Amino acid sequence: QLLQTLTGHSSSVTGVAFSPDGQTIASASDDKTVKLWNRNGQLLQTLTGHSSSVTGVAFSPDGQTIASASDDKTVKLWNRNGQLLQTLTGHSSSVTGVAFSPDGQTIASASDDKTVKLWNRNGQLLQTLTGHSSSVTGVAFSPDGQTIASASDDKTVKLWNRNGQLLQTLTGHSSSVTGVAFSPDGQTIASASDDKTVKLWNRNGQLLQTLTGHSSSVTGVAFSPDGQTIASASDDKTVKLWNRNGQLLQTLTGHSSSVTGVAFSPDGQTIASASDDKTVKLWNRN
Ligand SMILES: [Cl-]
Ligand SMILES: [Cl-]
Ligand SMILES: [Cl-]
Ligand SMILES: [Cl-]
């Protein structure tokens, strides 16, 4: 059920994240800003500095660092006062996503330059993971931090260890993979794809399930904190909720354009969805 609509961005909203305490929402947007919101929907700050569209946003687990990915080829790190701390340069094309390791001391970035780059918390470039043959669209850490998952326009998910050694390539999607997520218990990987499906995989690389129902590209996927519910965002303007057995639970309609990402609150009580209609919408579990 729709709880709140966050209006303020002047262009498409490309991503959304909850602060670790769940009291602050961060939105990324094509208007070159990240915005920080409260639960009532009141805008708190606007983070300016990127020279192009912002494609993703993430909080460090301690809640003290905000990372933003941008088409200007950089990741920028900010404090909770909206002040710029650092700019991570190195990617040769647009940065499409960013994520913090579970211990918060390593940062992974995905780029259209076909690589994932691993960075220390304080900006040092650690590794460049090469293997994808097209743009990398998203990245995620396993909750034990021992594995990294990367989604790519080359239609695969790749699984890496923290040395940057490629462990698995997940093959099955018919078009670009747009996002990837680990289940909280780490046993399940979910992938979203332009082929209109979500696919569920085990860490041994085996296809478990294909979640069908969306009528356009699936742009993102997320696991509830308890691991029992899957949320999918789609260019068909909806968010869909599924169970671990692939059954469609319910469909969240309300956005007037494509939904670009989705996230659960840390406490599992709220779903946030970002849309090309320039808003973030907050939903309850019912
Ligand atoms: Cl726009
Ligand atoms: Cl490419
Ligand atoms: Cl870690
Ligand atoms: Cl939950």
Tell me, in angstroms, the distance from the centre of ligand 1 to residue 131's CA: 33
The strand pairing partners of 75, in sequence order, are 69, 88
Alpha carbons 125 and 105: distance in angstroms, whole number: 12
CATH of the domain at 219: 2.130.10.10
Documented resolution in Å: 1.8
Alpha carbons 202 and 53: distance in angstroms, whole number: 34
- Please tell me the number of the ligand nearest to residue 93's CA: 2
- The number of CA neighbours under 13 Å toward the Cβ of 269 is 6
| Number of domains into which the chain is organized | 1
Tell me, in angstroms, the distance from the centre of ligand 4 to residue 72's CA: 35
CA nearest 159: which of 167, 199, 180? 167
Neighbours of ion ligand 3 (CB under 5 A): 101-103, 145
Tell me, in angstroms, the distance from the centre of ligand 1 to residue 234's CA: 17
Burial class of residue 216 in the structure, from the number of CB atoms within 10 Å of its CB (0-12 exposed, 13-18 middle, 19+ buried):
middle
Tell me: is residue 173 an annotated ligand-binding position: yes
- Please tell me the number of the ligand nearest to residue 61's CA: 3
Residues with Cβ within 8 Å of 69's Cβ and at least 6 positions away in sequence, in order, are 28, 54, 55, 56, 57, 75, 95, 96, 97, 98, 109, 110
- Please tell me the number of the ligand nearest to residue 101's CA: 3
Alpha carbons 198 and 223: distance in angstroms, whole number: 12
CB 68 within 8 A of CB 57: yes
- Please tell me the number of the ligand nearest to residue 104's CA: 3
Breaks (C-N over 2.5 A) in the chain follow: none
Tell me, in angstroms, the distance from the centre of ligand 3 to residue 105's CA: 7
- Please tell me the number of the ligand nearest to residue 227's CA: 4
DSSP-derived pairing of the beta strands 279-284 and 270-275: antiparallel
**Solved with:** X-ray
Angle at 20 between CA 86 and CA 279, to 5 degrees: 80
User: Which sign, positive or negative, has the C-alpha torsion 106, 96, 274, 239?
Assistant: negative
- The number of CA neighbours under 13 Å toward the Cβ of 272 is 28
Tell me: is residue 267 an annotated ligand-binding position: no
Alpha carbons 284 and 273: distance in angstroms, whole number: 11
Angle at 275 between CA 78 and CA 211, to 5 degrees: 110
Tell me, in angstroms, the distance from the centre of ligand 4 to residue 136's CA: 28
Question: How far is the first Cα of the chain from the last one, in angstroms, to the nearest whole number?
Answer: 6
Where b means 16+ CB within 10 Å and e means fewer, 93-122 reads ebbbbbbbbeebebbbbbbbbbbbbbbebe
CA nearest 104: which of 68, 145, 76? 145
The strand pairing partners of 156, in sequence order, are 171
Angle at 11 between CA 10 and CA 15, to 5 degrees: 115
Q: Hey, how many other C-beta atoms are within 10 angstroms of the C-beta on 269?
A: 13
Long-range contacts of 43-48 (CB under 8 A, 24+ apart): 43/6, 43/8, 45/81, 45/82, 46/8, 46/82, 47/78, 47/82, 47/84
Q: 3-class DSSP state for residue 253? A: coil
Tell me, in angstroms, the distance from the centre of ligand 3 to residue 145's CA: 4
Alpha carbons 266 and 129: distance in angstroms, whole number: 29
Tell me, in angstroms, the distance from the centre of ligand 1 to residue 149's CA: 30
> Could you give the strand order of the β-sheet that contains 188-193, starting from the edge strand earlier in sequence?
177-182, 188-193, 198-202, 207-211
Q: For 183, phi and psi rounded to 5 degrees? A: -70, 150
Residues with Cβ within 8 Å of 83's Cβ and at least 6 positions away in sequence, in order, are none
Residues with Cβ within 8 Å of 14's Cβ and at least 6 positions away in sequence, in order, are 28, 29, 30, 53, 54, 55, 56, 260, 261, 274
Alpha carbons 170 and 208: distance in angstroms, whole number: 11
CA nearest 27: which of 285, 279, 286? 279
Angle at 181 between CA 164 and CA 83, to 5 degrees: 80
Distance of CA 44 to the CA centre of its chain: 22
Tell me, in angstroms, the distance from the centre of ligand 4 to residue 96's CA: 27
Burial class of residue 17 in the structure, from the number of CB atoms within 10 Å of its CB (0-12 exposed, 13-18 middle, 19+ buried):
buried
Tell me: is residue 31 an annotated ligand-binding position: yes
**What is the DSSP annotation of 211-252?**
E---SS-EEEEEE-TTSSEEEEEETTS-EEEEETT--EEEEE
Alpha carbons 216 and 200: distance in angstroms, whole number: 18
Range of the domain at 184: 2-284
Residues with Cβ within 8 Å of 19's Cβ and at least 6 positions away in sequence, in order, are 25, 26, 59, 63
The strand pairing partners of 158, in sequence order, are 150, 169
**CA separation, residue 166 to residues 78, 160, 207 (Å):** 31, 4, 18
CB 35 within 8 A of CB 43: yes
Burial class of residue 256 in the structure, from the number of CB atoms within 10 Å of its CB (0-12 exposed, 13-18 middle, 19+ buried):
exposed
